[PDB]
Design a protein around this ligand. Structure first.
Ligand SMILES: CC(C)CCC[C@@H](C)[C@H]1CC[C@H]2[C@@H]3CC=C4C[C@@H](O)CC[C@]4(C)[C@H]3CC[C@]12C
Lengths: 295, 65, 335, 221, 50
């Protein structure tokens, strides 16, 4: 059961399938985020709290999007850009990825506070958007992108250079994978699910038109977020378990799990694509603001 | 770095029970950033495997080169 | 009995006006060359208002201006450096007019409260206090102007105008004779006569000293919203809600000529002239502002910079810049 | 150049003050009052120059109420100043079906109230503004309905002369005037002698309106 | 009713002039002050406060 197999089979699919999807995501995300950011910039009236949250989300999505071409270059042939750029890209990727989800969690909390405590909560709704956001979304990311700074070095494998993180004693990998799983889906996921479920609970029996539309929207948001981010973390968990020798099987199972992870993460990188559509282009106020900014 | 395109060196969890008499072919993979991997084909089923170099036979083979 | 006599007198007036009409302005102004298209670019934008803006008035030094909004704040700006000089809170947040004294000492404000508040700016304490409150009207204030530091003229919604006396706080003269609400008022350069335009589509020329009406001009089909004199004081221009402007004549006692276009169907909220009386500014309802020609009736420029209805407009004494305030809570200066 | 520094400091101070005042003022509730027959200001003022402004608080919420029955000018010329209010409280007297207008006996008073409500509800300025409706004189209507059948005002009505279905018919007729069914809602309440449920109903209506406004501000729909 | 008749009678006997003369006077006034008008002829930026 210790016979070694080679990852060349996965490399054959990874060389061709990945960069095209990355290019499509890059184009669509850059177009959407540019439209959103120019609409926000050309607005002269006082910005609401949701406008501030959308401005943070757009900045995070832009930071994530400007990273894809480097990974496309890495996947297609090899690495060329040197140690400094390798480390900088590694640093940017993590902060963008974690901010893009903590912003969603904070938006869900803000909407809960606005819908449930509508008459009373008006000052906390501003405190959570002016002071707590920085101690919220950004400080954990800037404090957890430290492993990339400590150790992320380019190295020669076969003929090609590679920008990959290298771990001492092959444990760091499992502990960091558990960290990724926990931060990605369990810190913001619980808050989002609870707040949106109770909002749906408080907007179910009403017979209004606007209330019905809001109920449909919250369901769409929950379904989109969970369908985007669940299978990727399931695959990561399976890979961590098989690496931790809890599951003892042949390496064809390893190949299948790697294929699953690759396809599912390629699918899940559409969060930067879908966020401007879900959070900006489905609102009447933002539509009116964009129409005014057009002329 | 996305997990999909990360680097994984092949031989993991080497054993220390392979006998010297079962060795049929000798080959060592040249791969850095991991523990040294030697893929020697066995004689029982002609299947390669990576084992740790702490074995007395492995130490003698290393010292005889 | 009296109705027949009044009809006969009106017929005689119409016959005399028709007889006095020998030629129109457009026939004898065709000699002059038309003015080129006016390209006006905004210079400053003033922000700080949180609600609709209903009036404004340039100072006599062409640097300071005052704006009134529904939020209950009367803001005195500084147009040169965008800095705000004063922000006076209001007792009532329903305001529809404001004015700036010729000497820069006092300001005025009025609205749905039927009380004209006069505030003193330059006090010993260096702040603003209520200098006087004028009461006695039975309708909402629509416009108020300062003849001097002591006398103020107001036009109310009960078909009346009043010449007040700030020192005593009591009315001095009352001008009646209209039919509908009075929604405009402008003082002549010599500050001896003023015209008023009411809802009955009739503009009346009053007499401050005598206290009696002198001339009445008709020709409009809807409510008159704005009025202003020619810089020489010999003629004036009226704007109504039926998307038209008209130029009358005091001496000829007859309408001169009209400004209209086939693509305009929204009413006028404010009109103004230039220093030489050549360019006529008109703020229409459709978020726009037009620059007509006082002698050719040809459009020569559009000032499109607002996201909502334009409610007030003004031109400095030297004609350097024009300030427009809209319902978007922004004042914009063009030059 | 100390004058420039002082001017900038003064501008910053009186900009922060205005921002704070606006933030404070955005947290309160404003209501307009309307009525056709008796100006609709009798019951609510006691129950709690040209305009009347009334402040009251209930369960930590500040309500201002604007009464504009002292303005006898044309309604078209000053109603746009009230665009953006939270709600309009319309008062209708139930004991006016058998009465006639003071000016002329041809038009019934409740028909004039219906016309005024139709004009207010379908105005171009008030499209997103909700209407709370009060039906007063419930006991007097109770007494009057038995003596005078509800047929002088509604000839097409076909029902027994009892309070419940007559009141339901009146409420249905008043609510049916609305044409913007998908943008605004009308809350109907019969005022009671106990001056403790009217303010609760107003509080509930204002809370619902605020929730529906926040549903749009947050961008959910 | 008598007040309106009296006002009409009082305002009926006033002096009037030909429309052509007034139009010529307006044209002359407009032409006289065409040299000093910052809106008609834009002022160079050296002396422009804005
Ligand atoms: C990698 C990181 C540290 C780069 C800097 C990113 C963070 C710190 C930047 C990116 C976009 C920035 C925001 C852009 C817009 C606004 C709106 C403004 O009204 C207040 C500041 C605020 C909210 C900024 C705060 C700082 C911000 C969130």
């Amino acid at each position: 059961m210790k016979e070694p197999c080679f990852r060349e089979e996965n490399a054959n699919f990874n060389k061709i399938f990945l960069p095209t999807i990355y290019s499509i995501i890059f184009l669509t995300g850059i177009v959407g985020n540019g439209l959103v950011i120019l609409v926000m910039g050309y607005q002269k009236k006082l910005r609401s709290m949701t406008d501030k949250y959308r401005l943070h989300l757009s900045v995070a999505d832009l930071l994530f999007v400007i990273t894809l071409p480097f990974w496309a270059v890495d996947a297609v042939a090899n690495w060329y850009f040197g140690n400094f750029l390798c480390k900088a890209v590694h640093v940017i990727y993590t902060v963008s990825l974690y901010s893009s989800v903590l912003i969603l969690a904070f938006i869900s909390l803000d909407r809960y506070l606005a819908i449930v405590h509508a008459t009373n909560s008006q000052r906390p709704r501003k405190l959570l958007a002016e002071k707590v956001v920085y101690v919220g979304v950004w400080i954990p990311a800037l404090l957890l992108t430290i492993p990339d700074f400590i150790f992320a070095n380019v190295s020669e494998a076969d003929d090609r250079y590679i920008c990959d993180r290298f771990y001492p004693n092959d444990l760091w990998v499992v502990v960091f994978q558990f960290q990724h799983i926990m931060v990605g889906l369990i810190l913001p996921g619980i808050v989002i699910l609870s707040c949106y479920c109770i909002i749906i609970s408080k907007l179910s029996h009403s017979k209004g038109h606007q209330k019905r539309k809001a109920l449909k929207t919250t369901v769409i948001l929950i379904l989109a977020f969970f369908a985007c981010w669940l299978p990727y973390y399931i695959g990561i968990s399976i890979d961590s378990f098989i690496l931790l020798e809890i599951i003892k099987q042949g390496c064809e199972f390893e190949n299948t799990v790697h294929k699953w992870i690759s396809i599912t993460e390629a699918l899940a990188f559409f969060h930067c694509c879908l966020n401007p559509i879900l959070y900006a282009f489905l609102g009447a106020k933002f539509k009116t603001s964009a129409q005014h900014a057009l002329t | 770095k996305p997990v999909s395109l990360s680097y994984r060196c092949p031989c993991r969890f080497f054993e220390s029970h392979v006998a010297r008499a079962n060795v049929k072919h000798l080959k060592i993979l040249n791969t850095p950033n991991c523990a040294l991997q030697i893929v020697a084909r066995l004689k029982n089923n002609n299947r390669q495997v990576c084992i740790d170099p702490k074995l007395k036979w492995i130490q003698e083979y290393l010292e005889k080169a | 009995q009296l109705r027949q006599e009044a009809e006969q007198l009106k017929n005689q007036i119409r016959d005399a006006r028709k007889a006095c009409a020998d030629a129109t302005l457009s026939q004898i102004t065709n000699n002059i060359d038309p003015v080129g298209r006016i390209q006006m670019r905004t210079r400053r934008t003033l922000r700080g208002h949180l609600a609709k803006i209903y009036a404004m008035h340039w100072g006599t030094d062409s640097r300071l201006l005052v704006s009134a909004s529904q939020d209950g704040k009367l803001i005195i700006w500084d147009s040169y450096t965008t800095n705000k000089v004063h922000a006076i809170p209001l007792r009532s947040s329903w305001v529809m007019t404001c004015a700036y004294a010729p000497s820069g000492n006092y300001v005025a404000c009025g609205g749905l409260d039927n009380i004209c508040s006069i505030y003193n700016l330059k006090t010993r304490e260096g702040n603003v206090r209520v200098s006087r409150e004028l009461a006695g009207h039975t309708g909402y204030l629509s416009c108020c102007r300062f003849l001097d530091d002591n006398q103020i003229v107001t036009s109310s919604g009960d078909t009346t105008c009043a010449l007040w006396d700030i020192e005593t706080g009591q009315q001095t003269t009352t001008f009646t004779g209209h039919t509908g609400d009075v929604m405009s008022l402008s003082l002549a350069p010599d500050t001896r006569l003023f015209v008023s335009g009411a809802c009955d589509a009739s503009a009346k020329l009053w007499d401050v000293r005598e206290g009696m009406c002198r001339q009445t001009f008709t020709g409009h089909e809807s409510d008159i919203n704005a009025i202003c004199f020619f810089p020489n004081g010999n003629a004036f221009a009226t704007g109504s809600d039926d998307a038209t402007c008209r130029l009358f004549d005091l001496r000829a006692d007859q309408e001169l000529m009209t400004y209209s276009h086939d693509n305009i169907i929204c009413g006028i909220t404010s009109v103004s002239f230039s220093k030489s009386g050549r360019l006529l500014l008109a703020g229409y309802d459709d978020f726009n502002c037009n620059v007509w020609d006082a002698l050719k009736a040809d459009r020569a420029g559009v000032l499109a910079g607002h996201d909502n209805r334009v409610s007030c407009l003004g031109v400095t004494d030297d004609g350097m810049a024009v300030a427009t305030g809209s319902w978007d809570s922004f004042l914009k200066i063009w030059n | 150049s100390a004058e420039d520094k002082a001017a900038v400091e003064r501008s910053k101070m009186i900009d922060r003050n205005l921002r704070e005042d606006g933030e404070k003022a955005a947290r309160e509730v404003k209501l307009l009052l309307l009525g056709a027959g008796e100006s609709g200001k009798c019951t609510i003022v006691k129950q709690m120059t040209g305009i009347v402004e009334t402040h009251f608080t209930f369960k930590d919420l500040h309500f201002k109420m604007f009464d504009v029955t002292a303005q006898r000018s044309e309604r078209k010329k000053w109603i746009h100043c009230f665009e953006g209010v939270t709600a309009i409280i319309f008062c209708v007297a139930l004991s006016d079906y058998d009465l006639v207008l003071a000016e002329d006996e041809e038009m019934n008073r409740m028909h004039a109230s219906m016309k005024l409500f139709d004009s207010i509800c379908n105005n171009k300025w008030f499209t997103d503004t909700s209407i709370i409706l009060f039906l007063n004189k419930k006991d007097l209507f109770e007494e009057k309905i038995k003596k005078s059948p509800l047929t002088i005002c509604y000839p097409e009505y076909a029902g027994s002369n009892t309070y419940e279905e007559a009141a339901a018919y009146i409420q249905c007729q008043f609510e049916d005037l609305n044409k913007r069914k998908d943008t605004k809602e009308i809350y109907t309440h019969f005022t009671c002698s106990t001056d403790t449920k009217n303010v609760q109903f107003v509080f509930d209506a204002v809370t619902d309106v605020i929730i529906k406004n926040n549903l749009k501000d947050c961008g959910l729909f | 009713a008598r007040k309106l008749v009296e006002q009409l009678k009082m305002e009926a006997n006033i002096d009037r002039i030909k429309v052509s003369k007034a139009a010529a006077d307006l044209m002359a006034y407009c032409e006289a002050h065409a040299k000093e008008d910052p809106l008609l002829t834009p002022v160079p930026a050296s002396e422009n406060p804005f």
